[PDB]
């Protein structure tokens, strides 16, 4: 609670929100872009790197990377349904 809001990439922030219970993303993605592998303007690896990225997208390799590294979930509690009452929620009536 030192920073009220943090504006950052959707992937990293969503991973942090999934991992950490006390953090949550907001929504309304803006400045939709993509992570790229930067190389110098005059390089021999340009086309081959781009083709390998595309090929890894076509098959499931990038999906496998997402599954193993980004798409695993610890504590989410994210739903549109109304909250379920718990001990602390109505401990007052029990003490009453």
């Amino acid at each position: 609670n030192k920073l009220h809001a943090f504006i950052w990439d959707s992937a990293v922030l969503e991973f942090e929100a999934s991992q950490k219970c006390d953090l949550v993303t907001t929504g309304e993605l803006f400045f939709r872009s993509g992570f790229g592998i930067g190389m110098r303007k005059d390089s021999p690896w340009k086309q081959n790197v781009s083709l390998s990225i595309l090929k890894s997208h076509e098959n499931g390799f990038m999906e496998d990377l997402d599954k193993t590294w980004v798409r695993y979930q610890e504590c989410d509690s994210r739903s549109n349904a109304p909250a379920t009452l718990t001990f602390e929620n109505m401990a007052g009536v029990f003490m009453l």
Partner: protein
């Protein structure tokens, strides 16, 4: 787009927006075309603005 414009909202994409190949639409050009750099920069500027 079809799900958005669907009448009665009877059609939905599974997975709440599940995309598998996750590629993107591009502007095809001839191999080694001189327009690639300018078009790429213009598209990135449009996205940024």
């Amino acid at each position: 787009y079809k799900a958005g414009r669907d009448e009665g909202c009877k059609l939905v994409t599974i997975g709440s927006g599940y995309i598998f190949a996750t590629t993107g639409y591009g502007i095809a050009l001839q191999k080694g075309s001189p327009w690639k750099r300018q078009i790429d920069l213009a598209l990135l500027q449009f996205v940024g603005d």
